[PDB]
Design a protein around this ligand. Structure first.
Ligand code: HEM
Ligand SMILES: *[C@@H]1O[C@H](CO)[C@@H](O[C@@H]2O[C@H](CO)[C@@H](O)[C@H](O)[C@H]2NC(C)=O)[C@H](O)[C@H]1NC(C)=O
Ligand SMILES: *[C@H]1O[C@H](CO)[C@@H](O)[C@H](O)[C@@H]1O
Ligand SMILES: [Ca+2]
Ligand SMILES: [Ca+2]
Ligand SMILES: [Sm+3]
Length: 357
């Protein structure tokens, strides 16, 4: 088909996603992999994972837009703490771009946001999820204090995910920060490059922790290898769950497998997101609109590196059968601050709408 703007696309049904991408980029992402992109990418996962094979359809409809359609239910569960701002940012798009369902809007917006993160894959995007569902029940969202057994079980119950797929999806923590785990600090990143979809998170979670970016006894948090912060440039935070996954016998070799393996990490993330984005649906019933997902920013191609203040002597390795790669170390005697802002500054407040969530 040829869309009103002149773009030739695979299917006429995909045309409406072109002005939706443009509006999302102009209004909330500004083509950056920043705070508002990060919040939307987390929303794609919390919308989709709230589904349970064992409990039946009444527990939740998966990638069904339930967070937007029932903004006062799930966003208020304690495991969904902080999800409200992303829901309030996307509801105005649901109302304006009103030929696209809330469910499709959530997944597409996640794809567009990810496209702004250098090294991300260009996600598959299928369209056609209905615009009516139910509110999910509580307890379906994994939490950072959860054990690996609990987490792997949640993902298997939700959609048959394998432990490989689960760790693959956690490549999203390469572009992720925390505001609620420690109430005294904002936007504590999970790796030293939270605006770049690289493999640093897999490397850095394997370093010995030496302190905390904020206070020392928050639920779901463990010691960080790069806890130094100053002004708005908050130190790195480490989640108990990511730490546990990196060291458990079921997942340790998969975790290490992504260190310094950018294209493998990106292709694996894409395959698992392909599955996540259609939870609650038969993929044979959705039409393929992958061609209207923006082309991602390319990585620079540089290998992973130990941040200054760290080195191979700091590794806490857990995979007996695979060789840890030989990496260089960024020069410098002490930790560099991790920038609060994509252009390296500290002053970049993201667009935020008020709303019902
Ligand atoms: C065991 C599974 C996971 C757990 C327990 C987990 C936990 C968390 C926690 C606690 C935060 C911090 C929220 C805050 O306090 O502000 C967070 C942030 C984030 N997570 Fe995860 N997560 C997991 C899986 C995922 C997956 C599968 C994705 C996406 C495909 C995802 C994407 C992100 C993003 C992008 C952020 C950053 C949001 C922001 O910076 O505002 N997470 N995660
Ligand atoms: C999907 O459902 C939502 C919620 O019912 C619809 O949102 C309404 O959209 C109209 C414009 O079409 C607005 O006047 C309303 O304010 C919106 N309602 C709410 C509660 O925000 C949306 O239009 C539906 N989309 C599709 C494709 O059917
Ligand atoms: C970042 O900053 C640290 C000091 O905070 C340096 O040691 C490093 O070389 C890099 O410039
Ligand atoms: Ca949902
Ligand atoms: Ca990163
Ligand atoms: Sm946030």
């Amino acid at each position: 088909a040829v869309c009103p703007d002149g773009t030739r696309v695979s299917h006429a049904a995909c045309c409406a996603f072109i002005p939706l991408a443009q509006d999302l980029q102009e209004t909330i992402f500004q083509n950056e992999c920043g705070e508002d992109a990060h919040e939307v990418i987390r929303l794609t996962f919390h919308d989709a994972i709230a589904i349970s094979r064992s409990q039946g359809p009444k527990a939740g409809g998966g990638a069904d837009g339930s967070m937007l359609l029932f903004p006062t239910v799930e966003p208020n569960f304690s495991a969904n703490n902080g999800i409200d701002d992303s829901v309030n940012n996307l509801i105005p798009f649901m109302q304006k771009h009103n030929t696209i369902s809330a469910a499709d809007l959530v997944q597409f917006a996640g794809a567009v946001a990810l496209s702004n993160c250098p090294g991300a894959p260009r996600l598959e995007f299928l369209a056609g999820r209905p615009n009516k569902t139910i509110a999910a029940v509580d307890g379906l969202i994994p939490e950072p204090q959860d054990s690996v057994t609990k987490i792997l079980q949640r993902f298997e119950d939700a959609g048959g995910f394998t432990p490989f797929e689960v760790v693959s999806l956690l490549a999203s923590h390469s572009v992720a920060r925390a505001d609620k785990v420690d109430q005294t600090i904002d936007a504590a990143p999970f790796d030293s490059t939270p605006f770049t979809f690289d493999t640093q998170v897999f490397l850095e979670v394997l370093l010995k922790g030496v302190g905390f970016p904020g206070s020392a006894n928050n639920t779901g948090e463990v010691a960080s290898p790069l806890p130094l912060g100053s002004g708005s440039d908050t130190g790195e935070m480490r989640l108990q769950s990511d730490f546990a996954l990196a060291h458990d016998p079921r997942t340790a070799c998969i975790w290490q497998g992504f260190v310094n393996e950018q294209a493998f990490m990106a292709a694996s993330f894409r395959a698992a997101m392909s599955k996540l984005a259609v939870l609650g649906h038969n993929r044979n019933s959705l039409i393929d609109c992958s061609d209207v997902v923006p082309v991602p920013k390319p990585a620079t191609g540089q290998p992973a590196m130990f941040p200054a203040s760290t080195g191979p002597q700091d590794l806490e390795l857990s995979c007996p059968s695979e060789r840890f790669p030989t990496l260089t170390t960024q020069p410098g005697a002490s930790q560099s601050l991790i920038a609060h802002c994509p252009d390296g500054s500290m002053s970049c407040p993201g667009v935020q709408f008020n709303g019902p969530a």
